[PDB]
Amino acid sequence: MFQSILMIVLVVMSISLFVCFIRTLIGPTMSDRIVALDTFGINLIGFIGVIMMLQETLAYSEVVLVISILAFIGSIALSKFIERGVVFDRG
Amino acid sequence: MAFQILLNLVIAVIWVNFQNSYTAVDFLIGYVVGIFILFVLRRFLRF
Amino acid sequence: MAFQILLNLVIAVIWVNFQNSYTAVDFLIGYVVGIFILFVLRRFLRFDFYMRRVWAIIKLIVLFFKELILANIDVIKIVLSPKMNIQPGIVAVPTKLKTDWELSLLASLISLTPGTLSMDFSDDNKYIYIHAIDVPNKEKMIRDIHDTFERAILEVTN
Amino acid sequence: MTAVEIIISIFVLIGGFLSLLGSIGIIRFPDVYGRLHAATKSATLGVISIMLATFLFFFLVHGEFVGKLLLTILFVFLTAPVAGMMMGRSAYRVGVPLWEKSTQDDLKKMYEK
Amino acid sequence: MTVLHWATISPFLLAILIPFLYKYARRIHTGWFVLALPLVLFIYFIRYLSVTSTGGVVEHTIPWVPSLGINFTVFVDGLSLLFALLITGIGTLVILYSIFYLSKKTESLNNFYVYLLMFMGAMLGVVLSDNLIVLYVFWELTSLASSLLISYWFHREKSTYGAQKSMLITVFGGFAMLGGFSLLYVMTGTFSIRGIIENVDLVTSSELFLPAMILVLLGAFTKSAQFPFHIWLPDAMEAPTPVSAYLHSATMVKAGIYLVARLTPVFAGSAEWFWLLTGFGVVTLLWGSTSAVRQKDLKGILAFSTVSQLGLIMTLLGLGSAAIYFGDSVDPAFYSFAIMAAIFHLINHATFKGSLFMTAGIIDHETGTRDIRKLGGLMAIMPVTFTVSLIGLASMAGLPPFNGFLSKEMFFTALLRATEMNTFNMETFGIIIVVLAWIASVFTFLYCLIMFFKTFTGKFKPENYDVKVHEAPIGMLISPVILGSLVIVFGFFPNILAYTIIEPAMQAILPTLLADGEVFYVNIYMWHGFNAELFMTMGVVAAGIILFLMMKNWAKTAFYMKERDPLNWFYDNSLSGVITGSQAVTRIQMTGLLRDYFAYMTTFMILLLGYTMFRYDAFTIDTTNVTGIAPYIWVITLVFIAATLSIPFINKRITAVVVVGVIGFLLALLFVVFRAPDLALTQLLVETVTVLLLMLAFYHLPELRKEEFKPRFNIVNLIISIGVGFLVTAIALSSLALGNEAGIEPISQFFVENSKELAGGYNMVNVILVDFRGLDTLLEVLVLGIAALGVIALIKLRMTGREDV
Amino acid sequence: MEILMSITVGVLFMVGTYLILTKSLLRVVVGLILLSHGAHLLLLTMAGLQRGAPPLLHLEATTYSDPLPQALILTAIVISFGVTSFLLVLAYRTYKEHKTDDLDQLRGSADE
Amino acid sequence: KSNDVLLHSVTRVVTFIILAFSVYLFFAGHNNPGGGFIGGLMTASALLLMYLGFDMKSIKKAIPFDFTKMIAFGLLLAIITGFGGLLVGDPYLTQYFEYYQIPILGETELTTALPFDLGIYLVVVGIALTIILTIAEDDM
Amino acid sequence: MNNLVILPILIPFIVGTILILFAKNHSLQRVISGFTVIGMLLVAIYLAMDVYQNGISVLELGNWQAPFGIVLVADMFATMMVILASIVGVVCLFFAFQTISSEREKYYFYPFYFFLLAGVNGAFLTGDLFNLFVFFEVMLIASYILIVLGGTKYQLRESLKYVMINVFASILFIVGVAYIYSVTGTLNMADLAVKVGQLEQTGVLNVIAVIFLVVFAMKGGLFPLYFWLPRSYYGPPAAIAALFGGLLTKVGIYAIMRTFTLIFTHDPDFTHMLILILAGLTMFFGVLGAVSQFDFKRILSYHIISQVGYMVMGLGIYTQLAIAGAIYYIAHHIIVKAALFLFAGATQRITGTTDLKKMGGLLKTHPWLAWMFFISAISLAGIPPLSGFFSKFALILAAFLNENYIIAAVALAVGLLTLFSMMKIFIYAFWGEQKHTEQQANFKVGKLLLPIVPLVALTIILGFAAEPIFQYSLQVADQILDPTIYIESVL
């Protein structure tokens, strides 16, 4: 019953990823796409937290922390690309 | 300097749980890890 | 603050030897007396007693969480409304906060609070540009920045 | 269902609902600036609420204080505002317009100079 | 290594010393040092007449590569001795001539004598080898040394054209012959010729008998310039004349005649041997005599002459093979006569033709021309050259009393006996052979009259020639006068050759025909009365003179206008064609277009994996031994598939990077569902650095475009893409199912047991990487390090292409 | 589940193959990145999926998912990262020099 | 031209945390997810975020490592560790571990796998930074 | 122990890495590189003698027994390939010392050279299929940079196609290992040979045999999977084209030999017939490419394709004699084909060009170059008694003994086309009137020819001393045609 609820929430999280993905395709703007991408990655942390309760394991606790770091590095770099056309300044 | 010592203990706070050893071996590894991090970042953080 | 925390740990460190416990809960008893030791001696020394600032911070963390919960209630209303009834815009909001870490705290709190999102800072750092979802109610938002959010930052700040 | 399972349930059902809301918001808000409201706030609280549930689950049911889950909460809080700021300000500079029914744009002036 | 081994390869050893002698003894014409070797090998071989002419043979062997059955075996019998004396006797005389024909001042004597001694040692090696692969080895070195001599004036286009044409026609034949020699081994187990002749029944019973015969005759007929491979011989005349005298008239063009005479005891006795030798012989006889008549350079006439006369010798070997068919149902004398005529004519031919190349060479050397249109009147100016030339041309025409009359009369005898054969369809074709041979004898006589009258008669025209004309120096004259003298000696005293040379060579060629210690009767004489063969000869003389007196008439014809052989068009067009065709076939593959390369490779993979999956019935699926799909995996998988299918429709690069990110994140999510945390981590970190890299590259690259849907191009692409996807899946599903049936315990249960006990870790993946399979990890960081150093080199080093070579 | 993942590999191979048959330099590099993803997902699926715990012995599980393929995939991902880096730089250096990203324009002289 | 007060503030805090987490990932590899590759890429990500957040001239003064020598030294550290067994007459790349006792710390496991995996780690950081920085600074 | 088995991998790997620390010092780079290639050669010769006297030496890395650990297996075939890579490694480096710019020395030329050689030796020696993939990747990435280094426009457009195609073939290798792992649960080549034989090479194990054939056929240069090769080899400097020409395709050919003599041996009516057909098509289409070209270095690049066809022709026939022919052919081709690219280098130094139509008369000016080229070129064409003759003759004789008449005929016809192609280079560049200048006529090339002299000497010696080389090839062929010798060594 607790495991039934975790399954329902994993389905809802899956649908959420589906709905973020639609804007990565359709935009309309590049800014829109990088926002959807940023939200897709944050939602993956949710999905894994719940997989860890269902599988009852802490093997994935490093994965959630890496995703949070990488989704951030991804968004900062794509935001700067869009605005300036360079990821790194000075060079 | 009091700042850097507490940072180092804050690194060791961040560190110690991860291992979950709660032994002298792991805390001493943890306090030293932060010394190395602080040394690497000394110029970045202007320490 | 860093001086006093370090002192307090030194006091507990020694105290646990004296009290023959390298057991955990004793470190707390020890640290607590270090607090009362420092509190009693704060007038004797020159100390802005550190636990006032540690409390200021706990209350700021609570506010970060309270505003985020409210912000989500605002979002739910808007997104589950049959029709988007929003009147958005970008508002320049004055700030007194002078330091970079205070501005960073404020810009982060605004973006976690109801209806608002930090866009940009003026060059002189005297204005925070805010994307607001309802510009009609901007006076409330400007009042909350001034009387709740910057008041709470300055308690941990000064 | 045990009282621990109920508390953890609430947190996971809120977290999963706010995640979906965040995504529905990325669809329904009229421009990238309103969609950043949903991305920055709902996606963020949704994921904070699930990490709490996960944290409370290993603590109250397995007696394990998994402090990496709390460090994940902290990274998400630190990072969410700055990411939304860098995505919204990049959009504004690149010329993505505010929505037509928007009624005030103090930032346009500033970027005039 | 016997002395007889050392003699055989001795000319290769001197060839190594020739460049030093030229360098450090230039005072002396290098030929003086070269002359001693063929002259001592001649005297050496002359000592074996004591054994061969008493029925003996000498055989010695040393192994060379016995694991392939290749042994260096030297074998002296009548046949091989005869060719060793020609090669070393006429060799001696041609070196002597070359000392006076090549001036040591401007000529590369070192190149000349190395190529020439290479040939000489290769030719002895051909005729003294009993192992067919050692004979192949020397046979190809004669083709090589021959083309190097045709090319001696390598700055001239004609020289290089002839050197190529010889090498291609003769090596083509040599490669086919190697296939022939390999079939004999497959029949008999030996490359020894004497041992193949012992097992001759295993040859003639075999289904590989005729292919082996054809392949062998391809080699013989290319090297001996039988029609249609004779076209290389006229183009070899670009050589310096000593070479034409030695290689291309007297020795190397007789290597195919040697090989056919040597393998008559394996192949003869059959209609196909009879007809391949007798027909190709008679056409070559007729084609070369007719072509010679229209040549207008002395060496042109003599080259076509040699073609013709080789066809005459090949026809006699062909007629003579009937001795083997009849065995002792007939007197051995009767059809063995043709084999005696062939041997006698080969000797005669070497004497008159070697002498006529030497006089053509003197005429060129002392008038600057070899053109029968510009010569005339040189009888009184060049009387020794005139006399030797007269003798050679009269012998070649078969006028008495010279050596060539006897041999031409023995030819007409052999031909008339063959008409009596009543086998092999000779009841029908015997007279065609006799008539075609008779016509060829008329044309031979006529090309000899043309060469004689146009060169030496009429009025000497001093203004045709640049230089003032004088006889040659005595040194140059000695070699043609000694050869001219033998023309006369063998004409009057033929029976000097009868039991010393000719009879032993007959026994080598017809070894089963007579009991041991039985000799053939050989008595050669000039007068046999008023028989058919004398009328045939009177015939030839008359017809020849008539056609010569009618030349005013037929010289205006279109036949006489041309001189180049009409088969040359084939050779020439076939070569241009290999190059054109090659280029067409190569262009369709190597289009330069990376899509074509991937489409060829993937199309080939689909057809071959597809065919193998049908042939072994490997399309299969196992739906039982699969794990469950939670409902949330259906949605994740649908996103993963949608994201992946959207990529070909995206036309903005930043969208592409975002959807690649999505795909990257979702593959990390699958790795978590599939219990692979170390993969999820790695996959996420690599995906992040790959997104920074794609954007660092996007500063340099242009934007994506919608590229237009060429219907054919992009539907073929679609069908190939689906076919790769479908086969990767089908083979995935079939591998899963065989894996499940098989139930082999995976080796990785050892890592489960022993990661913590024997390697001290609990993370089995890390333990495998650093401990059980640590070498792979060390090699993988080396891949990264090379890629990083490569990226530096690729960005910082920019060279023009003119810096190094 | 091995069936569904074998089909997903099929789809990465099919799109990745379609992209390498296009004229765009960037699209070819992306096709090559998708084929790598497919091969790596294939190597995991072929070992059997969801067959036990993550391969960490301190979990004291009965069955672990097979660790050997996981170590093969790690190596393959890491190599592939190295090579893709090198290939992206080679691609841009090629574009800069030829001023074209169209592979039709990179054909060169015919019968060179 | 851009006020980055918030990006520069946050980049300073997160960098501390990512580096600490990268060192944990490196040491945890033997018994938990992590190791040289994951640690190295995580550490590279921390230095890249500093380049992203600030600018190349400033961060190159701040963290002035020679990433190319780190490749060569990384590789040699990993090769040399593999000769351990040639001391005890064992095949190349034999790995050894013992549980020693140190008073200060406690029972501790020493392994040749640690220096081996440190060599992997140095190459991985070295190559990530050499590749990304060489491209980003490619003027021509 | 058998730690000697790893020295052919570890010396170049260690020296390669050390030379990155000395990028600035060019003299020290050359001296180290020079001693190192010579000691690789003496290590390789010593390993080959040891294995010849004392049997297969197996090294279990990490001390883990097969099939759990990576094994290296030095058998007689592997140790011959290790010597041949060492010979051409020495010669191509001493020729590079006389020819490459100092600019390439600044950018890691010598470390990439040694990492290529380590990769090639690891590929010959590994007893593990995933370890073969990784050694192929070390070889390939070192070739990716060596082939493009300099970044001329040609090099960038052709190198770009070479890398894309090779990346694709590396993916298909992974696909193959996925499917064979699913069936067998092992990567060890011996353990594979045992398990595949337990399963009788049933069903999809045939399909999997064909995927390995294609993967290794793409790396080997068999038709129709060679498009990456002919244009790419033109771009790098002669010392590198010689080493690539001579050795890199041999790693794919060795893998096809090792895989279809050890693992997939149960249905040669299918698999080895398929290999015979690709052999014959590779000989034929290779040599048409060669005949179509009029550029010295492009003609030689197509001859590589043609000649590898002969090496898989002996595996297709699959007898002791054919296999031993192929093993000798492999030794002859490495030696001759590396010499030929080195002669095209020295011809380009003299004339500035590789285009035959712009050349002529080098025989008059540079006879030592001309006669060394000629001897190598007729060896390639199969003219006796050089190495080329004996090795061709063992293959055709094996083909006739086995009644493979069509492939016997293709191998003879292709020989004649090769002769035609080598005589075109001689007629156009060495014969003729002098098309090069007077300054070019006085360029002295002997310093460039000395490194090539041993390869020329070896084609002569391998011809004359064919009997000991052929007896060694027969023993290799015996060893590998019985999978149970390798199997018992390792398991």
Residue numbers in the entry:
A (entry chain F): 1 to 91
B (entry chain e): 1 to 47
C (entry chain E): 1 to 158
D (entry chain G): 1 to 113
E (entry chain A): 1 to 805
F (entry chain C): 1 to 112
G (entry chain B): 5 to 144
H (entry chain D): 1 to 491
Give verbatim lines from the article.
Multiple resistance and pH adaptation (Mrp) cation/proton antiporters are essential for growth of a variety of halophilic and alkaliphilic bacteria under stress conditions. The CPA3 family comprises the larger Mrp (multiple resistance and pH adaptation) type antiporters which have received much attention because of their evolutionary relationship to redox-driven ion pumps of the complex I superfamily. Group I Mrp antiporters consist of seven proteins (MrpA-MrpG). The stoichiometry of the Mrp type antiporters is unknown but is predicted to be electrogenic with the number of transferred protons exceeding the number of transferred sodium ions.
In this work, we determine the cryoEM structure of the Mrp antiporter from Bacillus pseudofirmus at 2.2 Å resolution. The final 3D reconstruction of the protomer yielded a 2.2-Å map, allowing us to build a model including 1957 amino acid residues, three phospholipids, and 360 water molecules. Most of the 360 modelled water molecules are located on the hydrophilic protein surfaces exposed to the cytoplasm or periplasm as expected, but about 70 water molecules are found in the interior of the trans-membrane region. During model building, we noticed clear alternative side chain positions A and B (called alternate locations or altloc in the pdb) for several residues and conformational variations for short sequence stretches. Furthermore, we observed a pronounced structural rearrangement in a highly conserved sequence stretch close to the N-terminal end of TMH8 (positions 246 to 252), resulting in alternative positions of several residues, including strictly conserved His248MrpA. In MrpA, His248MrpA is located at the junction of three hydrated pathways. In the C-terminal domain of MrpA, we modelled Glu687MrpA in TMH19 with two alternative positions of its side chain. With a probe radius of 1.2 Å we identified a putative sodium-exit tunnel originating above the strictly conserved Phe41MrpB that is separated from Glu687MrpA by the hydrophobic Ile77MrpC and Val686MrpA. Strikingly, the tunnel is blocked by one of the two alternative conformations of Phe41MrpB, suggesting a gating function for this residue.
